[PDB]
Each structure stands twice: as C-alpha cells, then as structure tokens.
Design a protein around this ligand. Structure first.
Ligand SMILES: NC(=O)c1ccc[n+]([C@@H]2O[C@H](COP(=O)([O-])OP(=O)(O)OC[C@H]3O[C@@H](n4cnc5c(N)ncnc54)[C@H](O)[C@@H]3O)[C@@H](O)[C@H]2O)c1
Ligand SMILES: CCCCc1oc2ccccc2c1C(=O)c1cc(I)c(OCCN(CC)CC)c(I)c1
Ligand SMILES: *Nc1ccc2c(C)cc(=O)oc2c1
Ligand SMILES: [Mg+2]
Ligand SMILES: [Zn+2]
Lengths: 4, 271
C-alpha cells in the first residue's frame, strides 16, 4: 500500500 | 492553545513524555546547506541543468534512471556522506536518544545526517530511503554502499558484478513501495506519548496522516515556518506550534528543557  | 512551549518542555523534564516519535522533513537540513535540486538557483540545480533533466522529479523516476542515471549519481556524489555536517537540529534529536526519550525518528530526508548525528540504525525510519545500502535493479542482489561508492565518486555508473544490472542505492523512487521499516508506523504511532514535527511541509501522503494515528490524549508539537498539514486542517486540544524558524525554536525549546550545556558539549564532542 504505502508507496512513495 | 491552552498548552504553551514551556509546558511541552516541563512534561519532558518531569519525564511524563518518554517515548517521543519525531517527524522530520527538509526544514532541518536547510541550515546544513543542503542545496535543493529543484530550486532554480541552488548549488545543485546548475550542475544538473547541463544534464538531461526535464523536470526535477525525473531523478527519482525509475524509467528515467534507465535512460540516464548520471544526474542521480551526480546528486548522490554531491550527497555521499562526507560532504555535509549535521546542525543543532540533529544533535537535539540525538540527545533525545541519549536521554532515552526517542521512540522512533521517521524522516523524509535522504542526506544521511541523522545517523551522522550518531543515532543508531534501529531508531530511524528513513522513509524515502538511504545512501547506505544498495540493491541491483535487475537481479535484486544487495550490496554495501561502500562497494557502489567507489564507482560513484570516480564517474563510473555502477553495474552488478554478477548480472551486470545498474546497481541502485535504496533511495525510494516515485512509485516504489516504502521500506519494510516503514511498517513500524503501525506500532510506533499508537505507542507514542509525544509527537514532534521538525521542519516538514506535510503536503504528501502518507507521511502526513500519521500525525493523526497518535492518540487524542497525546500532544502534537510542530517546529516549522508555518502551521501546515493535518494540524492546519484538524488541530486538536493539545497541539502547539512553535511558529517561526526551526533552529531558533529548537534553541528556545532546548533552553526551556535545560539542555544548554549538554547541547553545548555534545556538539563540541561530535565535531
Ligand atoms: N535533506 C534531504 O535529504 C532532502 C532535501 C530535499 C528533499 N528531500 C526529499 O524530497 C522530499 C521533500 O519533502 P519534505 O517535506 O521533507 O521537504 P519539503 O522541501 O517538501 O518541505 C520542507 C519544509 O521545511 C521548511 N523549512 C525549510 N528550511 C527551513 C528553515 N531554515 N526554517 C524553518 N523552516 C524551514 C519549508 O518551509 C518546508 O515547509 C522528500 O521525499 C525528501 O526525501 C530530501
Ligand atoms: C510549486 C512547485 C513548482 C513545481 C510544480 O508546481 C505544480 C503545480 C501543480 C502541479 C504540479 C506542480 C509542480 C510540479 O511539477 C510538481 C510538484 C510537486 I511538490 C510534485 O510532487 C513531488 C514533490 N517532491 C517530492 C515530495 C519532488 C522533489 C510533483 I510529481 C510535480
Ligand atoms: N510517492 C509518490 C510517487 C509518485 C507520485 C506521483 C507520480 C504523483 C503524485 O502526485 O504523488 C506521487 C507520490
Ligand atoms: Mg560492484
Ligand atoms: Zn544484478
């Protein structure tokens, strides 16, 4: 989920 | 706000807040002299204009890297630990850790200077990556930064010794999923009894939202030019904003805690  | 800056000093002093989670941006690196690649005027924008860079985002764009990675390796070279000192704002943070107060240091930066201020690896969440470890962009083989530092400093584009892929540091590039260390936010944020936002503009997600994953009993502190982000849309009953220059706010805060001499000596020791 947590992308840049 | 009912709570001032001294109150936040006194709680720490009395040892009420003992597990401070800190959220740092580029605000703390400015006074170290870290030149903004974007800024049409900084020290690094002039050298990268000769290079093939349409927009500044290109350097941390993965596709664009494969056409021309030298502006990244020209950046990296300019950043590779040795060029720049840390300032007060890091040594303050390191002193939290020395005083057994820092739970975790979440950082946007890529300049490496938190570790330079002598914080351990474990206390950090280098959210946009690090110039410590490498990983081949074909075979994924991991390498020490030293390996691929020899190549950057010499004007060679590093290539995997086995598979010949271009070996890339573990900087996060636009699109890439954040380090597995980020997954710590899950445990640290609801396990925090002080939120301290040091010089970050809070535009981009996720990093901002994590301001709210703390508990509503918990004070949120912000040392920065201005009131930004989810403090500026959803403030709470225990928020404080040292609104002004980051360094001077850190200099006032230090003083209201009573870490003058220990800040004075630390910084003398480390430099
Ligand atoms: N130091 C670094 O390694 C570095 C530098 C620039 C950008 N980046 C990368 O680019 C992105 C930038 O995001 P960000 O929010 O961290 O930085 P940003 O540039 O988006 O925001 C920095 C904030 O700090 C404030 N600030 C800067 N100098 C200040 C000073 N002297 N006093 C008070 N406030 C000051 C600015 O007003 C701004 O609101 C991140 O992904 C980061 O990894 C890293
Ligand atoms: C105001 C900064 C000038 C560049 C710029 O202005 C815009 C206005 C609207 C839409 C895009 C821009 C824009 C950009 O091209 C731009 C700015 C940002 I901030 C942006 O997000 C990445 C910002 N940053 C990492 C946090 C990259 C250095 C991106 I993708 C594009
Ligand atoms: N992390 C990240 C990566 C890429 C982005 C693009 C391309 C646009 C944007 O607005 O935000 C991004 C954030
Ligand atoms: Mg090699
Ligand atoms: Zn390889």
């Amino acid at each position: 989920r947590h992308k840049k | 706000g009912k709570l001032s800056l001294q109150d936040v000093a006194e709680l720490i002093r009395a040892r009420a807040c003992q597990r401070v989670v800190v959220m740092v941006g580029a605000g703390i690196s400015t006074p170290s002299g870290i030149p903004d690649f974007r800024s049409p005027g900084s020290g690094l924008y002039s050298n990268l204009q000769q290079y093939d860079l349409p927009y500044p985002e290109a350097i941390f764009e993965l596709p664009f890297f494969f056409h021309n990675p030298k502006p990244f390796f020209t950046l990296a070279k300019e950043l590779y630990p040795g060029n720049y000192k840390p300032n007060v704002t890091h040594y303050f943070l390191r002193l939290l850790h020395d005083k057994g107060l820092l739970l975790r240091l979440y950082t946007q930066n890529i300049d490496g200077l938190e570790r330079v201020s002598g914080i351990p690896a474990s206390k950090l969440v280098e959210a946009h990556g690090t110039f410590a470890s490498a990983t081949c962009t074909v075979c994924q083989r991991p390498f020490p930064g030293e390996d691929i530092r020899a190549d950057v400093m010499a004007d060679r584009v590093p290539r995997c010794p086995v598979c010949t892929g271009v070996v890339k540091p573990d900087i996060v590039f636009f699109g890439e999923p954040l380090p597995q260390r980020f997954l710590l936010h899950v445990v640290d944020f609801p396990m925090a009894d002080l939120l301290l936002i040091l010089g970050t503009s809070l535009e981009v997600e996720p990093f901002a939202s994590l301001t709210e994953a703390v508990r509503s009993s918990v004070p949120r502190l912000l040392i920065n030019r201005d009131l930004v982000g989810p403090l500026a849309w959803h403030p709470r009953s225990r928020d404080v904003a040292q609104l002004g220059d980051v360094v001077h706010g850190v200099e006032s805060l230090v003083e209201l805690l009573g870490w003058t001499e220990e800040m004075r000596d630390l910084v003398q020791r480390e430099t």
